[PDB]
Amino acid sequence: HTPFIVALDFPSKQEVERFLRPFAGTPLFVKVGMELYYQEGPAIVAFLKEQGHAVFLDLKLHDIPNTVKQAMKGLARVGADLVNVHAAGGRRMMEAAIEGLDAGTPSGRMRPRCIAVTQLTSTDERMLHEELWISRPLVETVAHYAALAKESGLDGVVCSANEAAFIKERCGASFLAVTPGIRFADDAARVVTPRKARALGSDYIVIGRSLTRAADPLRTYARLQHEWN
Amino acid sequence: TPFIVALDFPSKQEVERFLRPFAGTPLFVKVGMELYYQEGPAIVAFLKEQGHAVFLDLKLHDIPNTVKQAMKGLARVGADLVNVHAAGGRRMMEAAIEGLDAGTPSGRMRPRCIAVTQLTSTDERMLHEELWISRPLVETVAHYAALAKESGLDGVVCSANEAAFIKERCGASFLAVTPGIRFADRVVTPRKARALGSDYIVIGRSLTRAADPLRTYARLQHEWN
Ligand SMILES: Nc1ccn([C@@H]2O[C@H](COP(=O)(O)O)[C@@H](O)[C@H]2O)c(=O)n1
Ligand SMILES: Nc1ccn([C@@H]2O[C@H](COP(=O)(O)O)[C@@H](O)[C@H]2O)c(=O)n1
C-alpha cells in the first residue's frame, strides 16, 4: 500500500498517541520495536490497528525453532502485518517461523509477511570477524544469509539501500528489501535519502526521528512522498 | 534455588492453574516469548505478586541503542533475570547493562543479565554451513561466553557439558544456566547436571506437564544432592 514505515521508537502508548494525533484519518504503516512492545504488550498492536494502521512488529525473533513457531502463531493472531527474525537462527528456525504464521492465520487469508535480519546495521566487518568469528566478507555473509532466508520461504530481509540491488540479484526481484537508516538531505547528527533509497532498489524504507522529531510532521510526511515519487 | 521452571503455557489462565499447588513455595520461573508476547509486562507483575522470581527469557538481539531502551523497559517491569544473544556484539551487551541500570529504581540491584552463546538447537553443521562460523562449535561457545564475560554480563545459557569449560574460561562464579533437563525415565539427570557444574537448571514439561507437579518438584530436589 505504502513504501514508508514509521518507527514508533517510544516507551509508551501515551507518547505514541501524541505523535499520531495529527495523522488522524491518514492510515500509516508503523513499526513497533522492542522498546514499545515490551512495555505496552499486545495491547499497543490492537490499538494501532483500531486506528486503521498497518503494523510491523520488529521483535527480531531469534530462539529455538518450536519457540519461534509458537510465538509467530500468536503474532499472527494479534494482527501483525509484518514481522522479522534473525537469519542467524538457522534455516530450520526460519521455516518454523513461517509455519507458526500460517498456523495463526485464518483459512482464505494471507499470513503476515516475514523478513529476515541478516547482519545488523550496527555490525561492521571488524565485529563480524573478531567478535562473531565469521571469517567471510560482510557483504557475502549478508548475501548468504539472505539466500538462506529465501530458501526458508521468507519474503525478504532488512538491508541497507546499498545492499538491496545485490540481494535481489541473488534472491530475485520479488525478494523484499526493507531498509532503515533514512534521513533527508538536510538533517541528522550509513544514511541515505528517500529518493536515493528508491533508486537503489529498496521496497520499503524505515523512517524514524526524521519524522517523529519534525516541527511539521504532516508537511514532512508529504515531503517524504514527493521525494520518493 | 537452582531450579528455574519454564512456564511454557499459552496464557495467564494456564499459568495460574499450574502455580496454585505451589502457593506455599517461592519459585524462580521463566517467561518466554510465547507467554510474554501474549500477556505483556502484566504477566511479570502478577508472578512477582505471587512471590516468585522471574527470568524474562526474550533473548534480545538488536542494535545497541534499541536493546538499551528495551532493557530500561524490562528493568521497570520487575524482571529479576534477563538475557541477550552474544551474537549481538560487545557494544550491544554493554548497552543492555546500561539500560537495566537506567531502568532500576535505586533500592535494588539491576536485574541480572546473561547471554545466549549458541542456541541449544544449533549443531556444528548449522553453525558452519549456515552461519558461516569457521571454528569448532565448542570453541565458538567459549569465545561467545568470553565476549559476554568481557561485556560485563553475569553469565550464559549453556548445556551442562559446557559448564565447566565455560567457567574455566570466564571464571567459576560466571553463571551457567542450563536447559534441556530430563529425568532418567538432551542427556540430563538433575544430579548429573549439578555434577557438571550447572548453577541453575531450567526444567520444562518434565514438570509442567507431570501428572503431579508438586510431587515432581519434590523429586527434583531429592535427585539434587
Ligand atoms: N544506528 C541505527 C539507528 C536506527 N536503526 C533502525 O531505524 C529506526 C530508527 O531510525 P531514525 O529514526 O532512522 O533513528 C529504528 O526503528 C531502527 O530499527 C538502524 O538500523 N541503525
Ligand atoms: N531443544 C530445546 C528444548 C528446550 N529448551 C529450553 O527449556 C525450556 C523447555 O524445557 P523441557 O520442556 O525442559 O525441554 C524452554 O523454555 C527452552 O528455552 C532449549 O533451549 N532447547
Side-chain angles (χ1 to χ4, degrees):
Chain A
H1 184 180
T2 180
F4 319 127
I5 297 177
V6 185
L8 301 182
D9 293 326
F10 307 98
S12 70
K13 181 183 178 180
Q14 296 70 196
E15 293 159 65
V16 169
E17 279 186 292
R18 289 172 185 161
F19 167 65
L20 295 182
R21 186 190 303 129
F23 288 91
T26 299
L28 297 170
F29 188 178
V30 303
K31 187 173 75 63
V32 177
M34 300 181 183
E35 167 181 42
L36 175 53
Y37 196 76
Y38 296 170
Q39 300 182 66
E40 286 296 328
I44 197 62
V45 177
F47 174 68
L48 296 174
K49 293 182 66 62
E50 291 174 56
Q51 305 291 161
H53 300 301
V55 177
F56 168 18
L57 284 190
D58 185 1
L59 308 176
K60 301 184 178 61
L61 279 68
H62 186 181
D63 206 316
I64 70 176
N66 184 63
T67 300
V68 174
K69 179 175 184 172
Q70 286 307 303
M72 285 305 198
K73 293 186 187 179
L75 269 53
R77 286 196 292 277
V78 73
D81 295 282
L82 173 66
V83 303
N84 57 6
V85 301
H86 271 93
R91 170 173 170 171
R92 177 59 258 181
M93 179 200 88
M94 298 194 117
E95 305 181 310
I98 302 299
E99 278 171 43
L101 294 173
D102 282 318
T105 304
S107 294
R109 173 171 285 81
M110 294 286 82
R111 67 166 170 69
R113 283 160 296 190
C114 184
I115 59 176
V117 166
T118 54
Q119 284 299 317
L120 288 168
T121 54
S122 64
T123 297
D124 56 58
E125 184 125 58
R126 177 168 304 179
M127 192 193 103
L128 185 64
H129 295 169
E130 301 179 56
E131 280 180 44
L132 272 45
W133 270 11
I134 290 175
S135 288
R136 316 292 284 293
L138 182 64
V139 176
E140 303 199 311
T141 304
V142 164
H144 187 251
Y145 279 34
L148 201 69
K150 174 59 183 179
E151 290 171 50
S152 301
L154 273 54
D155 316 305
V157 294
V158 166
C159 62
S160 71
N162 280 291
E163 303 180 306
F166 81 76
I167 284 177
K168 283 174 174 294
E169 176 187 277
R170 214 283 189 52
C171 302
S174 68
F175 203 51
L176 299 178
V178 181
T179 74
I182 300 303
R183 290 289 186 301
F184 286 112
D186 60 3
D187 54 298
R190 55 163 177 175
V191 168
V192 56
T193 294
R195 169 168 293 90
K196 177 65 177 310
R198 184 179 189 179
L200 291 178
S202 299
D203 291 296
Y204 292 88
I205 51 179
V206 187
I207 301 72
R209 295 173 71 77
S210 298
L211 182 57
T212 54
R213 296 301 179 299
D216 293 307
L218 301 188
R219 209 295 165 58
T220 298
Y221 187 63
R223 176 185 176 184
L224 195 61
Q225 298 183 292
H226 183 187
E227 309 201 319
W228 175 272
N229 293 53
Chain B
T1 65
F3 312 129
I4 292 176
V5 176
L7 293 180
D8 296 322
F9 295 107
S11 74
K12 175 178 179 176
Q13 184 169 303
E14 289 65 46
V15 175
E16 294 180 302
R17 183 177 297 99
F18 168 80
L19 295 176
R20 205 160 308 186
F22 295 94
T25 306
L27 296 173
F28 191 0
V29 303
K30 187 171 76 60
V31 173
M33 296 182 182
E34 183 181 57
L35 178 56
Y36 195 64
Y37 292 179
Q38 167 59 47
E39 301 294 325
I43 189 65
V44 180
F46 168 73
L47 296 170
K48 289 165 61 69
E49 290 181 58
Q50 304 294 162
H52 298 301
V54 182
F55 170 15
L56 198 51
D57 178 19
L58 299 177
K59 303 185 182 62
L60 288 72
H61 190 180
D62 204 309
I63 57 170
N65 178 275
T66 297
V67 177
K68 182 173 183 172
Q69 298 306 131
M71 286 303 195
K72 191 174 302 181
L74 298 191
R76 293 180 296 197
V77 301
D80 299 291
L81 172 64
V82 300
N83 59 353
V84 297
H85 267 94
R90 300 187 191 183
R91 240 255 309 302
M92 183 206 79
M93 304 194 103
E94 297 177 309
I97 299 299
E98 312 195 310
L100 292 172
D101 275 315
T104 299
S106 285
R108 53 274 288 79
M109 296 179 82
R110 65 168 173 65
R112 288 189 296 181
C113 185
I114 57 174
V116 172
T117 58
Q118 283 298 308
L119 290 177
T120 65
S121 55
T122 303
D123 59 21
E124 204 168 67
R125 182 204 63 75
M126 177 180 133
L127 179 75
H128 292 178
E129 302 306 318
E130 287 176 39
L131 275 49
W132 267 14
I133 289 182
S134 55
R135 281 303 286 286
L137 180 56
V138 174
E139 289 171 49
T140 295
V141 166
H143 180 64
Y144 278 35
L147 293 180
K149 169 62 181 178
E150 307 178 320
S151 296
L153 270 62
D154 310 299
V156 296
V157 170
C158 60
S159 73
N161 293 309
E162 286 129 48
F165 178 52
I166 291 179
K167 289 170 176 297
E168 163 172 42
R169 190 80 125 71
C170 314
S173 65
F174 201 57
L175 303 177
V177 180
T178 65
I181 301 294
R182 284 299 188 301
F183 285 111
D185 56 357
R186 313 300 71 177
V187 186
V188 191
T189 294
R191 193 183 181 300
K192 180 62 177 181
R194 179 183 179 177
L196 294 177
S198 295
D199 294 300
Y200 288 111
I201 51 177
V202 176
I203 180 65
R205 276 78 61 65
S206 187
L207 173 66
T208 59
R209 300 303 175 178
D212 197 323
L214 188 50
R215 171 175 280 300
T216 290
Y217 195 72
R219 178 190 174 189
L220 180 60
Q221 299 171 299
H222 291 179
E223 288 198 311
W224 184 276
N225 49 49

